[PDB]
Symmetry: D2
Subunit: 392 residues, 4 copies
């Protein structure tokens, strides 16, 4: 049998979007209220409170009403002034990408760039900060998703703080799937969204903003105002007694309310543990069947996405097509520099269950062997299962 391209797949095991939690799908269909209805104003306030609790935040996170690329661009537009000296950290497609936004708001850009399967060495950051005391803003991506690798943002953040500089973090593809919070890395702007590990659809930004960052942006006359890119306009909009700059995405808010309920109710630690175990099992299965994990070492491999290097002579696009057509299972391509060079299996929210690593490994193995490889698929499943049983 074959699954046609026009029809739904059986399992989406991508690095996001994945199908949302079923409770969230239902939550998206909640009553759409007028945004100035007193019941919605109370709801919105409560959703901000739930976000604050989930993000372990000492102050209110800001919800912005676009998918997290809005928070990332807006953070650059608001926190980076033309006299700032920005140090961008790039270990992948998104990290490198952020440097273009920094360059938009300040002409002074320093960068540390490493190969796109490695992580940023905190010591290289320390060295650069010593060499360049004029640095005022540092930007970093936690999980550079097209690579399935993790940067040590907490150790980086402590150094940035040591040098009196501001920190911007992209935690879009990491928050909720591992232990990470604005406080943990001393972030001044920490950008995430519910559309990766939190198992909601794209549409909203969750942004932690330090009191120091508030002061800086508010004093910046170039910080966007009366703009979709404005953070400062949203400063008090959490409050049931205050207006919204423009109409909030009411249905996405209902979905986020549910996503947060699920996370808080399951218990964030339990949620992180199942992501990490699923990815661990996946990596063990990948290695045991005769494939290689992309990341240069296992210690920097993401618990929320496994990237698998494409063997020579293997068309990565035909591989993904074959996994879907044969087995109903969808994986992600790479992006930019990793496009064509690896395949990505997400472990995110509802897909972060070890049984899905088993399903992923089988579909991946199957498609590889269809392409003429001779993978030990059984050995792979057994290695992944040994990982799961060892944790039991």
């Amino acid at each position: 049998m074959r699954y046609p391209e026009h029809a739904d797949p059986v399992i989406t095991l991508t690095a996001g979007p994945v199908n949302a939690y079923p409770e969230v799908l239902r939550g998206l269909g909640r009553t759409v209220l007028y945004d100035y209805d007193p019941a919605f104003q109370l709801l919105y306030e409560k959703v901000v409170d739930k976000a604050q609790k989930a993000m372990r935040l000492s102050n209110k996170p800001v919800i912005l009403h676009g998918e997290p690329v809005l928070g990332l661009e807006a953070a650059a537009a608001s926190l980076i002034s033309p006299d700032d000296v920005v140090l961008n950290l790039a270990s992948g497609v998104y990290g490198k990408g952020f440097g273009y936004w920094a360059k938009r708001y300040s002409p002074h850009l320093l960068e540390i760039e490493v190969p796109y399967n490695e992580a940023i060495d905190p010591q290289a950051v320390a060295d650069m900060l010593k060499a360049h005391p004029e640095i005022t803003v540092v930007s970093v991506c936690h999980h550079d998703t097209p690579s399935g690798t993790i940067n040590p943002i907490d150790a980086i953040g402590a150094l940035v703080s040591a040098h009196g500089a501001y920190l911007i973090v992209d935690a879009v593809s990491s928050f909720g799937g591992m232990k990470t919070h604005p406080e943990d890395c001393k972030a001044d702007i920490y950008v995430t969204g519910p559309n990766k590990c939190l198992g909601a659809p794209p549409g909203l930004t969750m942004m932690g903003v330090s009191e120091r960052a508030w002061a800086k942006m508010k004093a910046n006359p170039l910080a966007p105002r009366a703009s979709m890119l404005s953070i400062v306009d949203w400063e008090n909009a959490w409050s049931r007694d205050k207006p919204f700059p423009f109409t909030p995405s009411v249905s996405e808010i209902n979905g986020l309310d549910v996503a947060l309920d699920l996370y808080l109710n399951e218990g964030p630690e339990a949620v992180w543990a199942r992501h990490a175990l699923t990815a661990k099992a996946m990596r063990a299965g990948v290695t045991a069947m005769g494939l290689s994990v992309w990341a240069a070492s296992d210690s920097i491999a993401s618990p929320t996405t496994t990237a698998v290097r494409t063997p020579d002579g293997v068309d990565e696009k035909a591989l993904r097509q074959a996994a879907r057509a044969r087995y109903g299972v969808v994986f992600s391509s790479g992006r930019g520099e990793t496009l064509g060079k690896l395949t990505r299996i997400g472990h995110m929210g509802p897909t972060a269950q070890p049984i899905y690593a088993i399903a992923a490994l089988t579909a991946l193995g199957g498609a590889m062997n269809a392409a003429g490889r001779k993978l030990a698929i059984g050995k792979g499943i057994e290695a992944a299962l040994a990982v799961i049983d060892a944790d039991a």
Copy 2:
């Protein structure tokens, strides 16, 4: 009895958000696909084709992934450059407000302004264009929702076209609820969204873009690129064979698919008729009970919102609060310079059914008489019902 503020209302009869069509609420909970899944790529293309059909467009409309203020700001940012002289037409809050974005992107701003219960006079527009050959861009709002009034954008669009200028039209709160389309008014940029008459929640923009606007925007060095504010980035994103600039709002696209299906299957003309009839019934009831429609004349009054002038002396905020606490019925306040001046009752998509005019009339009249007025509520119901019964 009284309805708690924290509790959900009975009927939301605002000028938007209103509750989405029940089908759209379910559509919102459809499977969330990977955006690069072939079934999603095909869906996305066929949603643009549905929008193209609904908008009677000769070319593809652009869907942008923010609620339509994004379209308005992006249209300014991309089309207007400092070489342009902009004529902004302002008969209300949104028309006036567009001039502020116009002024952000060119220092040359001409305006025609009328009080916020009137419409722009096409003869005034013709006279202004003749007197100012230097005008290159004209902006206009079709239904300036906070006043519940309509501008003659088709006659205006034709004058503007003869002049040789670009037309930017805000049709957010009119499209789907009355006869209007980009090529009816020769619009270069026509911004609408499904969050008013089409009965979907806030979060997407549907934009008609003329070939001439494409060329102007793509030439402009100051037009947003690699930005949430970018129209140009999204030009080819309709195609199943092309990437998305950033992750589309998958659930909102699902809701929009359904909303377009509903509109196209019911028949646009039939849909416009029931908005007009609901509104006509509303105005007749308002007048008969002893209130005044805000609009300077009945001929410019919107078929998708009835604004009702607050009697001098009546506290409009307390009135709306009373309509909800007593009757469970929610109305919109005015906005900006109409706030405190009028109450608004939307007739939009699911609420554009004449029986909701009856409910609205009784709650508004009920609240008014509790504020000490002495309205002829029964007379008002009978006049609205005569309009319903007369409908040939």
Copy 3:
């Protein structure tokens, strides 16, 4: 305009089914678990607990897996033995109807029957019980819905208990819309369901069963066993540690879970008060416009349904057709003896909001006047609104 018969109506204002609460519609789409899954076994136990709390019950109510006609037939089949002498009370279509089931299980049937717009006089019941001391079982319908009238079941129940007899109550169309509970009327079997005032779809029975009734049925060798009609087989099925006689309606259970949440959370007293106020307003509007409430006196009129007598020369079926085609509003016909003689407006769960009485009155008036009546429709709305405002 006209609403076609094939398409959805705008408002269903029937005596049931009405559209379910929106939370319940969503609840129906909850994950369907295996019925022997430990999570479902816990859920089922919890839903029985919620039912017990809502019904003010000292022991566990039994959930049966068919709409309440199952509970009614099964109560007759299990509680009425061939040597029982049954006194059936009939003030309408359902009360009279129950006598046929009693006659199925015992040849000894006494009846008190009154006209189908009146209620049972508790004194007539007292008189009959004195005249017939051999009576062992008494059956009564609380709200004989096709008549929109209420029997004094608490006063009847105290008398039945005084004479040592068993009481069967049909509270299908009353429980949840007024103060009524198995304990209140001393019922031995009290049959209701969530498909009227509780605002869920048809599919389940909620049955209060006295310890005395348990003893009787269990000792009855004719009580259905290994049967859809069995009550005794379900005795312990509430328990997470016990099997289900056959597969429970898992989705209906999810809907009931939500329906009960809504009722308990709103507060049963507040729920009863809004039903009673909506019906009161309706009756006042009916009388003021020149129509007559069916019930022989206002004191026996149901708070959960208003029945309106059809004027001479008026085709009741054409009337309902006209209300739906003109205004999008659906009413119920009568049944049996009341078919053709009255129209029924339910006030049940989500339709038990006074604004819906206003909508109902207008549609009813409108259709009457289309049929050549000359109703004072305005006066009707004003009288209903005066009722609502008097309660404010």
Copy 4:
């Protein structure tokens, strides 16, 4: 990690209930209409027509409003009278169980019984009919779910027809998942439901009834009338111009409408192929890892359920508990005389996709090896995948 019993599982891979198709979960939340609303009357008729098409029926199937045990009991109660001599065929729990209802409605019961891993032998059936001209009714179960085995009902139906007897077929767990229809097996009463392979929840019965069965049931004074157990009451209820004996399960009808659409649109043959392929893959994996399929032979093994014999010595209950606690995967126990003897993995509607066989194999093998077995799990996955890859 471990999955809490109170918490929802990851994958329900039982022999029913399984989670409904996502479309069906949404269908369940469609508008609940008044059952005498013309749009509902029309819906109900068109759902019977869809069922008629799906069942390849020459006449209307009857929908009964209880889960299919209602159909089975009603079929006995209505068709079998004490003049009948019944031959009940029992190869498992449900076949044996039907004889108990047969014996309730006629004292004359003949049986052919085989052990609960075998199928009925048609030659034995032919021999029995020849030896007993007095047989007038024959009962048979197609897929006796607790054994995961199939009877040759088409050959049996033909023998029974030649004899001159009535055939009652239980196809609850086979219809929709393999080639079977009332007129394939000359069924007089063919009972199925959408709660297994059609992927809807429990609560409705779909019954094919021959014209001869109609005449026999309608003649029988002991056939249930004015009863939940009545087939005859529901004869004309398909028609939009006819009443319902009692209130139909409106939401379940909505779910069924969707389930029929899915089945008919996918194409029944394609649907049967994917159940067969999933099951074939499952059996191959079970055998390769070192377990035994319960069925006496592969040829009688069901394409909609694989029963796996518990190794002697293994605690089957603890095993299922372990598969859920370790892997989040839920299997069915056996029932009655198969309880403790085997574990069941359903391949039904949404779970009939070969990738779920892979997940099931890994969880079952995983649980077994935790119970001390030494299965070749990888071998098992590779054998199941060879079957998937071989599928021409």
